[PDB]
Design a protein around this ligand. Sequence first.
Ligand SMILES: Fc1ccc(N/N=C/c2ccc(Cl)cc2)cc1
Ligand SMILES: Fc1ccc(N/N=C/c2ccc(Cl)cc2)cc1
Ligand SMILES: Fc1ccc(N/N=C/c2ccc(Cl)cc2)cc1
Ligand SMILES: Fc1ccc(N/N=C/c2ccc(Cl)cc2)cc1
Ligand SMILES: Fc1ccc(N/N=C/c2ccc(Cl)cc2)cc1
Lengths: 390, 390, 390, 390, 390
Amino acid sequence: VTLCSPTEDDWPGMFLLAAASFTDFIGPESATAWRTLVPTDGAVVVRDSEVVGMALYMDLRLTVPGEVVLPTAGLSFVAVAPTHRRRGLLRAMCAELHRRIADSGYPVAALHASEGGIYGRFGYGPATTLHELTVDRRFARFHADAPGSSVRLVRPTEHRGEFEAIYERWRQQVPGGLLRPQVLWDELLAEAKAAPGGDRESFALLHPDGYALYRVDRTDLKLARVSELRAVTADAHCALWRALIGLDSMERISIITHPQDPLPHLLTDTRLARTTWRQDGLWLRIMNVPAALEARGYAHEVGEFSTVLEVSDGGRFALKIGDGRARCTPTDAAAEIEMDRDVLGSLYLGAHRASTLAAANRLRTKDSQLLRRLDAAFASDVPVQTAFEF
Amino acid sequence: VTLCSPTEDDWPGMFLLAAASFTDFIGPESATAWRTLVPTDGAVVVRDSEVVGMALYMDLRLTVPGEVVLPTAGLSFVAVAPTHRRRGLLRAMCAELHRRIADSGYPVAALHASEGGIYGRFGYGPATTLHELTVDRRFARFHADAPGSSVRLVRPTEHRGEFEAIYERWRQQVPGGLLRPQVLWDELLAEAKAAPGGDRESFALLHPDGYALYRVDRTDLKLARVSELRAVTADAHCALWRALIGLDSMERISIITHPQDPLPHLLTDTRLARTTWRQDGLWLRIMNVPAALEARGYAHEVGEFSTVLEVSDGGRFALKIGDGRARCTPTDAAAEIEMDRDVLGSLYLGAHRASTLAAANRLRTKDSQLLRRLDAAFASDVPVQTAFEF
Amino acid sequence: VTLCSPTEDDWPGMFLLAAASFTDFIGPESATAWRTLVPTDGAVVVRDSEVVGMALYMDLRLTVPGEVVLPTAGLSFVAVAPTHRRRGLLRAMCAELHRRIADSGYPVAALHASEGGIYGRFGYGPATTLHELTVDRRFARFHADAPGSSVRLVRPTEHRGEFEAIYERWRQQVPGGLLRPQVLWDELLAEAKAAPGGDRESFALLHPDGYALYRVDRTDLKLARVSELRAVTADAHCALWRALIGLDSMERISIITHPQDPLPHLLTDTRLARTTWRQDGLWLRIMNVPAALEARGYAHEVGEFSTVLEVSDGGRFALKIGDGRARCTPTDAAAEIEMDRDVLGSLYLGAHRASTLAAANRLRTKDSQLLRRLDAAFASDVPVQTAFEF
Amino acid sequence: VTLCSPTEDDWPGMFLLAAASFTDFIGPESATAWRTLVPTDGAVVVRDSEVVGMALYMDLRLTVPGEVVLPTAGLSFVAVAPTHRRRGLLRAMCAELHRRIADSGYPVAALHASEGGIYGRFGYGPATTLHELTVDRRFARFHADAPGSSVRLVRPTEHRGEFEAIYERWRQQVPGGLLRPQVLWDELLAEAKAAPGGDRESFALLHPDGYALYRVDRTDLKLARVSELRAVTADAHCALWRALIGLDSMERISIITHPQDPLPHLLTDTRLARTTWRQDGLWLRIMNVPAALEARGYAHEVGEFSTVLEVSDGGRFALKIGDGRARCTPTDAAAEIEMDRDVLGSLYLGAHRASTLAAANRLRTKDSQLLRRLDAAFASDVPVQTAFEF
Amino acid sequence: VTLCSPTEDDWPGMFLLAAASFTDFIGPESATAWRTLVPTDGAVVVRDSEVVGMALYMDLRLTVPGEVVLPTAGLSFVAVAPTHRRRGLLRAMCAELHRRIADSGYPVAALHASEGGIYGRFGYGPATTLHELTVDRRFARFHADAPGSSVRLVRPTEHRGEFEAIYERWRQQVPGGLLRPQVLWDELLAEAKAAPGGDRESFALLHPDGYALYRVDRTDLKLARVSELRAVTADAHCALWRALIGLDSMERISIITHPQDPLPHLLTDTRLARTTWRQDGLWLRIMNVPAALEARGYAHEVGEFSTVLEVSDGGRFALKIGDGRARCTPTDAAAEIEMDRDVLGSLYLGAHRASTLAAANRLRTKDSQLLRRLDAAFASDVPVQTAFEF
Ligand SMILES: Fc1ccc(N/N=C/c2ccc(Cl)cc2)cc1
Ligand SMILES: Fc1ccc(N/N=C/c2ccc(Cl)cc2)cc1
Ligand SMILES: Fc1ccc(N/N=C/c2ccc(Cl)cc2)cc1
Ligand SMILES: Fc1ccc(N/N=C/c2ccc(Cl)cc2)cc1
Ligand SMILES: Fc1ccc(N/N=C/c2ccc(Cl)cc2)cc1
């Protein structure tokens, strides 16, 4: 078992391991489209010869609080052969890619986790929260206060330009936003086709400042699933939900959204927007603590404050936050805040409160005033959302 | 149909309407215990004679941010006969009790809603959030960082004093906390008995600084339901969860908790603490805007700021917040923030963000800086929880 | 929003609205086959430009009691864009088509309702009843009295002529019968093909005087679904059910039939033919009360009688019924029977009893003798059935 | 944490731990009846004071192949407080009881396992197999060859003597048979009463040479559950099943029986007796290898043979089997068969084949002829059954 | 209704009856591949003309105890038209094929039964047992004693030669083994392809001495179904199960295996390998009692013994068994053992014990010593397995 960058010869073995490893496997043609996002030396394989281990990263652009865009290494296509469990192959592959990612100059790495108990040990913390809402739309009435026909029902394939422009405005404004390159729009509008024996046809609801893609469920013919809703203004968001509640042949509309989705508040009965499912979305590994902490914006409400942050096996820093900006410098002074690297990734986009992690002792300080100040400073004005799975 | 305070003669008719109206009806003896919390003139009935309408309030003590305790009118036992729907009986009863509550000097009223689409119109806003967690405890491993045998398995009836003392410390520290009077401890430790053909026996896990009451589900014999967990320190909270994960005959532990429960963070796999259910807990009606706004503490992080708040059909106030305190005074100056009374009740304990309600247009301002300052000021340092249903 | 007859340019927009509106959407090629049944000026669209509203009628031939065939306008493809709910588009489209249908000389209009609470207001009453029977065929034994190998198992595509001839004899004899044109036989024998990932292959049971088309359910491989059973004699009906009970690999046979299906009575245990589902089939709007009332046959058993029938906003008539025939003439004499137009459509084919509608006060008279006579006169000798959905 | 024999003072703490540990807890009165089977020094408790650990054994009589009855220590009431998991309390309690059991002169210990992954490490092997059969009795027809009204429907409480005499004949003839003392007959005929909100009334089917106790399921009113069927002759077994298939109001009869139950072979369709569930019944720990191996009968079919058996940390023996008897003597000669103690317990009553355990390498030899001879010798002429849970 | 061998003209009618009779119908192309195994005069049809009845046999090679291979007639494609039930068509077809099979020189016939209550009357007895195991692989840990990366994850289509060679070694060693001809390998590796709207892609786990073919379930995406596992050594069997338990994205692995599968014993918790389903596999009809009884090996453990066996309407024989061989000769001496022909087929491969069939009176003797000797003699050293369905 040796670890190396794959050759063109390795890719059929990698597709075999992928097919056996991922039930939702996009297939070889779709995988070749995603490969365009993998930089030279972005992939590792383990051979025993046949491929028993693989991992790669993609070049991504992640929006963080303050509308700042970071170069981000997106880990994906991570698989160990069922024949080679418990031989340290994942630890070896993650160590090699992290070395390359760090040397390449990426301040953060990100991934979507297949299981929740794996990536904490490699320094990844869950940084966004997926929240499924199911609306029983037969009972749904809009509140007198709710904004609002500016919405059109359209064929997705015919309005790509308009989707692309709205999404581009969306992703620059929202923490968790990702640049979506051309190949991923090619892949998205191909999944919008009805498949024989698979997913039904997708429709779009199109506003000047928002869109929703939805399809009826394969089996439950009274359920509409919203695959994607991107709204740049509150008017667009409300207009799109007026149109979705107007699907009079459905009993239920479901969407995977974020905890601060205002939909419940648009209705006279907030309870009709039931939370049916919750899960970690994007996981972050802070590769470079100083570059990451200095890059994001902080809340202007909290007054200037200074502390000493230690990350376990990741450095100790004098951290000064004021006027929405942070300066993070090396120091050997006594730490006032200690935490593992994963905990920092969980705080970084504003999804988890420092005081909540402190209550579980994932984050240690003897100053409760400092906890309150961290909480307020790392909060995001714009609620953090999840762009797309990779 | 006339509206009046019930006589002793009215109470069998009220119990009949209760029995027909509430499936979870506590019964006449339990109801007579709760009656001790109803003040003279705390109840109204509508006669056609027989009782076709009733409503009452109880004298409660609610903890709000800054560890401040407010006298609170708890609406309960609200029922209209199925024979007298759509005759305005609820509107008439709510108007009469609100008059009495306001004249009596209560700054806030509260209730638990049977449905979500009813009480918004009478000025009640959902102020706390119930969050059910289900843990598959067969997979649960505590994180290296988690605190921690200080916990004892005990019979609830034998440790009432200890439960009472822990709960009393809990409710004074936590927004949403309610004083639990003797009659409600009498009722709680009677529901801890096994019933023939009903609920199984309750056990307690007792720490110096926390307790958990739990019972196996009637039908699902691999599910333990935690009815109540009160923990005054993080050590107590973690110790109690170590003991509950040690119920080796159960597959699943469920609890109704709050969104900021640190349990997920105590585990190596945060995902094992699944959110299976979410709902509005306590609803608040702010009876007196100035008395309520001046009574609670505000976050010390936000700098002194001033604005003009209008509540629809509820006054206009010059609101000045600084050094964690608010001054709220009458004014005829232009409003900078407008909202219905229910919206204010939703903001009041810190469960809902002003910027989330603004996105749904439940709260209108033309200053986004002011929105950020309201958000930060109305935030609660201690996460808001739900004490007990009434 | 203006209302007009569609141009050839409008039909892709109409197919888009159809696809988004109907989950069971037959698709553009199948829809173009059905278009052959739509007369010139049989369709309306609403443009905002894009199609936000459509409705059309087809030229049909409906059999009514006395084996009389009426020209019938079959409303279909009725859809409002989810973006344009609650703007009166359905009321405007139904008013325009009803004007055209009435001017064209149709005595009745008909439809199949997607929901039960919509078409009553436009004068449509449910006129036939669908009754699903599920037979646990493992227990089914034929009664000593039951008639009866004259039945052949065949490929549907190879015996079209024989199906067509049996159906043609069936539809002329039975109230609810519809002429089935060539394009609908083309469509029926195409749905008899197995689809990859969809419905399984259809088989036929063929008798000289009856046929049954059946297929195994997609998911429940022990359920056979009879899509269509047409039997012109009792011998044919019994023979076909002997063959279906002989599907020894099935546990259950289901069929959508009518309330008077004699199948339960063919068995030693009538209970084995369980009623699993009931619903309104065909809805009727009587366009011209006199032409419709004079056109159908009436029961020869009831003696000659005369009354005055008023239809709300639909005329007042002197109605004389004797010798199985009715004469319906204008009058200003006092009404003895009043009812909304929808109620008349419900009475017209014999599926609902006048005395049942009277008990709900949908039909008012002060003469109970007259009620008994209406009941007996409007009864159908041959039980009313449902031909095919449109 | 110290380990000692319980005092009379300890038993309320033990009942509390029992109640919290066992959902099917028989209760304090029933537990006091079972206590009569616990010898002086048959119980251990761990105190921290409160009871955090308990275990005991009962004096039992187990029938092994050759109709030989062994004194048997039945481990039961084994519980560790959920507050004291992972502190070695079970290992400490099992070690102390095993010392006492061995010193007392018991050749074998037995238990029923709450989980399958626990007791292998303490030398217990699963020795009997529970097999649930569910008969769809609506289809059940007896074979022309099946024996056979000698069976009476009776009230259990009125025929105790007759049940006791049949069971006593049953348990002396069958490997796995246990003596059932008076206190357990007291407990059995008390569970035969209908409980308000619990189990329905039990009935008995009584033959001169067999009985069946059955009751309708609490929730599934078309399921009869046979709690116990004891038949000393094939005639009795068949007669009792003729009576149970005659419960014409039931769809299904279920019983927990053994893999060699001849019921399937009594029917024309063997498939109607579906195996719906399988599990380990009784677990055995061989305390004394020589006393246990010499005590049971062996199959007379296999010719005299000799080998050397080693049990891991349990001795090495020259084992000579011939004329249905074994002689087991100490030796230092090379082992021909090696196995852990648990494996021996699994072989001992004839439920598991030596060649099946060898295929999993739980039992090692380099002689396949010796494997065949062990298989044939340890086989039981009478199929092994499970008497009652303890 | 006349009975004859089909002409080439008959085969479209036979495919129609097949399609209507078998839901799992392989289709006309797959059926034409299987036809290559049908000898000249291996098929009968009944015409009324159209095909209302068919049956055929295939030339197979069945392994019986002692590694002896018998020519075997495999009955298949047996169907009666649902229009011709209860006219004796099956009895007539089975009688004609049995005449041909017997005259052709086959000692045994075999089939897979669609129902359990049919083929006993034609002399077929169930001879193998299918046992579904479902492993919750999340809990599965291998025992310290379990053997063991020699296993490779591969594409089935690319390793046909290797599968064929392993299977060929497997089928010669195991009772129930069948020769698998080229056409059936063609058919197997075509079912290994993903179908649009049907089964997902198959993967292989390949060892020098074993293979497993598995696929994820269509609907349950956490279930892996092992279609086939063939292991010639215990090492191969254990290695393949280590690889299958390493499918970390699955919760459950299911396999249809045999009752003596050692998998449960490879695990620390035997209970994790749950038996979820049990059914008769292969049915045998002994065509020639003497040729069949003399052909198989018998257990060398039982000493030489002699008896007189009568088969009902099948002969009486002096049966002498010693040194693993039987001599079976005609006699008119008193029978000591009587049984129907089906019972003999059930005993023949060792799946059912003579003493179990005797307890149901399917097998009559007055000598219990003789029963014990039959049991021991007809036992199979190698556990009987089921090769493939036909
Ligand atoms: F060569 C490759 C490079 C990158 C990749 N990542 N794609 C993986 C992926 C994950 C989730 C979805 Cl919803 C869609 C695609 C796949 C292949
Ligand atoms: F006279 C009465 C005065 C007050 C009351 N409120 N109790 C109502 C109530 C609601 C919920 C629970 Cl879990 C328990 C009790 C009931 C009767
Ligand atoms: F252009 C068109 C004209 C008429 C139509 N009606 N067809 C609609 C329809 C409804 C139900 C079924 Cl089962 C099948 C078809 C559809 C399109
Ligand atoms: F003090 C005691 C001594 C022995 C015991 N064992 N009984 C335990 C037990 C287990 C299973 C059943 Cl179905 C019934 C009872 C219980 C208490
Ligand atoms: F012409 C034919 C000759 C023999 C046959 N037998 N095949 C039948 C069959 C049964 C089960 C399976 Cl899993 C696969 C195939 C089918 C047609």
